[PDB]
Design an enzyme around this catalytic site. Structure first.
Site, PDB file in Angstrom:
ATOM      1  N   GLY A  45      14.926   5.703  10.582  1.00 48.13           N
ATOM      2  CA  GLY A  45      15.630   5.900   9.333  1.00 48.13           C
ATOM      3  C   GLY A  45      14.870   6.776   8.362  1.00 48.13           C
ATOM      4  O   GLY A  45      13.692   7.086   8.547  1.00 48.13           O
ATOM      5  N   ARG A  46      15.582   7.172   7.309  1.00 46.15           N
ATOM      6  CA  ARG A  46      15.049   7.988   6.229  1.00 46.15           C
ATOM      7  C   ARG A  46      15.554   7.428   4.913  1.00 46.15           C
ATOM      8  O   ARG A  46      16.533   6.682   4.870  1.00 46.15           O
ATOM      9  CB  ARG A  46      15.506   9.445   6.330  1.00 46.15           C
ATOM     10  N   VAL A 113      14.513   4.569  -8.159  1.00 48.29           N
ATOM     11  CA  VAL A 113      13.422   4.186  -9.058  1.00 48.29           C
ATOM     12  C   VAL A 113      12.419   5.337  -9.089  1.00 48.29           C
ATOM     13  O   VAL A 113      11.651   5.500  -8.135  1.00 48.29           O
ATOM     14  CB  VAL A 113      12.764   2.882  -8.582  1.00 48.29           C
ATOM     15  N   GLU A 117       5.936   4.621  -5.596  1.00 48.43           N
ATOM     16  CA  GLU A 117       5.393   3.422  -4.963  1.00 48.43           C
ATOM     17  C   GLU A 117       4.127   2.949  -5.657  1.00 48.43           C
ATOM     18  O   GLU A 117       3.279   3.754  -6.050  1.00 48.43           O
ATOM     19  CB  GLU A 117       5.058   3.689  -3.493  1.00 48.43           C
ATOM     20  N   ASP A 156       7.748  -8.232   4.506  1.00 49.29           N
ATOM     21  CA  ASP A 156       7.219  -6.871   4.508  1.00 49.29           C
ATOM     22  C   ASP A 156       6.509  -6.554   3.200  1.00 49.29           C
ATOM     23  O   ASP A 156       6.555  -5.420   2.718  1.00 49.29           O
ATOM     24  CB  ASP A 156       8.324  -5.846   4.786  1.00 49.29           C
ATOM     25  N   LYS A 158       3.861  -5.240   0.901  1.00 50.60           N
ATOM     26  CA  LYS A 158       2.776  -4.271   0.957  1.00 50.60           C
ATOM     27  C   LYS A 158       2.991  -3.301  -0.192  1.00 50.60           C
ATOM     28  O   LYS A 158       4.105  -3.203  -0.699  1.00 50.60           O
ATOM     29  CB  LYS A 158       2.754  -3.531   2.304  1.00 50.60           C
ATOM     30  N   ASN A 161       6.076  -0.860  -0.531  1.00 49.90           N
ATOM     31  CA  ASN A 161       7.416  -1.374  -0.767  1.00 49.90           C
ATOM     32  C   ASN A 161       7.653  -1.836  -2.198  1.00 49.90           C
ATOM     33  O   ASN A 161       8.720  -2.388  -2.491  1.00 49.90           O
ATOM     34  CB  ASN A 161       7.704  -2.522   0.204  1.00 49.90           C
ATOM     35  N   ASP A 174      13.041  -2.233   0.613  1.00 51.61           N
ATOM     36  CA  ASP A 174      12.931  -2.379   2.061  1.00 51.61           C
ATOM     37  C   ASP A 174      13.060  -3.826   2.501  1.00 51.61           C
ATOM     38  O   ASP A 174      12.065  -4.555   2.582  1.00 51.61           O
ATOM     39  CB  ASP A 174      11.623  -1.819   2.608  1.00 51.61           C
ATOM     40  N   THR A 191       3.357  -4.983   8.617  1.00 52.00           N
ATOM     41  CA  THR A 191       2.218  -4.091   8.784  1.00 52.00           C
ATOM     42  C   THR A 191       0.956  -4.906   9.064  1.00 52.00           C
ATOM     43  O   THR A 191       0.768  -5.982   8.485  1.00 52.00           O
ATOM     44  CB  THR A 191       2.013  -3.188   7.546  1.00 52.00           C
TER      45      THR A 191
END
Ligand SMILES: NC[C@H]1O[C@H](Cc2cc(-c3ccccc3)on2)CC[C@@H]1O
Ligand SMILES: NC[C@H]1O[C@H](Cc2cc(-c3ccccc3)on2)CC[C@@H]1O
Length: 340
Positions: A45-46, A113, A117, A156, A158, A161, A174, A191
């Site tokens: 995905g992108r 947003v 990140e 997830d 981290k 995200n 995510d 991760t």
């Protein structure tokens, strides 16, 4: 727990379950948007900045290739992601605005947003002061209190995200590994630096893995690097299961004490997973200065406002090769994604 909090979470669950049982579908289409820039890209995905052609609003459009989702055994995970995202509602969760599918792809159109990140800001500053890390941590504690009360595990957490919005608050993005779980679940995902020991050891695990990951996140925010760092995943895993961690001398005693209780290898002893649940975290000395209600209501001045020029600014995201969004003349994997 105060009755005001119990009644808040009871209403939150009622509203989540209504949408969970009757998910929205097919609420936009691709040619309603102009493609602007790729913000991120991965195995199947992108994420692309798009502009709605009628309203002019900007969105982050996550595009998943159905054939690649199938090949990488992510069907159930992608159905989880969309069904959860269309059902949740919380100040620190990125909002799903539309979803749809076509012959080739699945699409989730999210609020954009522009602040970027947390990962980028943390790496550019080096480390966050404890008040700065605590402001973000408090938002994650409240977000996990909300998600876990809906029987959702996030899986997830981290810095990549966690997006920083125009007010300097966190928006979690995510939900590719999020899952509704009453009891235990078994999938190996996440991760490496953030995996709880019970995931690495292939056990049936529960929401306690999110509280472990919060310990990793707080450590990384306050130190500038994660607690079990090593060059290869196999060496990371050995450190995670070992039950030892080294704290920088600049950590406060309260921070170390909190982290020892979040980074507890024995899940039955881990903060967030004891009889008092999240309140062992919220009542910990490291959070003594935190006004939980004021954080939720977004009344606390943020430690840091990201620099950006407007809702279309992409300067806080990176550059990627720009690739086609191709839509096959023939339907692919229609059966697998019927419910999307
Ligand atoms: N007007 C008074 C306020 O009371 C409520 C505030 C509130 C928030 C939470 C909460 C609990 C767990 C996780 C996240 C949030 O519990 N109570 C709701 C509206 C308003 O902000
Ligand atoms: C990379 C990347 C960026 C995003 C994103 C998601 C929602 C809003 C804004 C950006 O998700 N992955």
């Amino acid at each position: 727990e105060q009755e005001s909090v119990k009644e808040f979470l009871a209403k939150a669950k009622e509203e989540f379950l209504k949408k969970w049982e009757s998910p929205s579908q097919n609420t936009a289409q691709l040619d309603h948007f102009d493609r602007i820039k790729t913000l991120g890209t991965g195995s199947f995905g992108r994420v692309m900045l798009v502009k709605h052609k009628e309203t002019g609003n900007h969105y982050a459009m996550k595009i998943l290739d159905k054939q690649k989702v199938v090949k990488l055994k992510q069907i159930e995970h992608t159905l989880n992601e969309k069904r959860i995202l269309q059902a949740v509602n919380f100040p620190f969760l990125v909002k799903l605005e539309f979803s749809f599918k076509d012959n080739s792809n699945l699409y989730m159109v999210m609020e954009y947003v522009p602040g970027g990140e947390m990962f980028s800001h943390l790496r550019r500053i080096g480390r966050f002061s404890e008040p700065h890390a605590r402001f973000y941590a408090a938002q994650i504690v409240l977000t996990f209190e909300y998600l876990h009360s809906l029987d959702l595990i996030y899986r997830d957490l981290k810095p990549e995200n966690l997006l920083i919005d125009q007010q300097g608050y966190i928006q979690v993005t995510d939900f590719g590994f999020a899952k509704r779980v009453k009891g235990r679940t078994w999938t190996l995902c996440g991760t490496p630096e953030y995996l709880a020991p019970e995931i690495i050891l292939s056990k049936g695990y529960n929401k306690a893995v999110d509280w472990w990951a919060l310990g990793v996140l707080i450590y990384e925010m306050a130190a500038g690097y994660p607690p079990f760092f090593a060059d290869q995943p196999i060496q990371i895993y050995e450190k995670i299961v070992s039950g030892k961690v080294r704290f920088p001398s600049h950590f406060s005693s309260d921070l170390k004490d909190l982290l020892r209780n979040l980074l507890q290898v024995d899940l039955t002893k881990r903060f967030g997973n004891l009889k008092n649940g999240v309140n062992d975290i919220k009542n910990h000395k490291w959070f003594a200065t935190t006004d939980w209600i004021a954080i939720y209501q977004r009344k606390v001045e943020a430690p840091f406002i990201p620099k950006f020029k407007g809702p279309g600014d992409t300067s806080n995201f990176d550059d990627y090769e720009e690739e086609e969004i191709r839509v096959s003349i023939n339907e692919k994997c229609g059966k697998e994604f019927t419910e999307f």
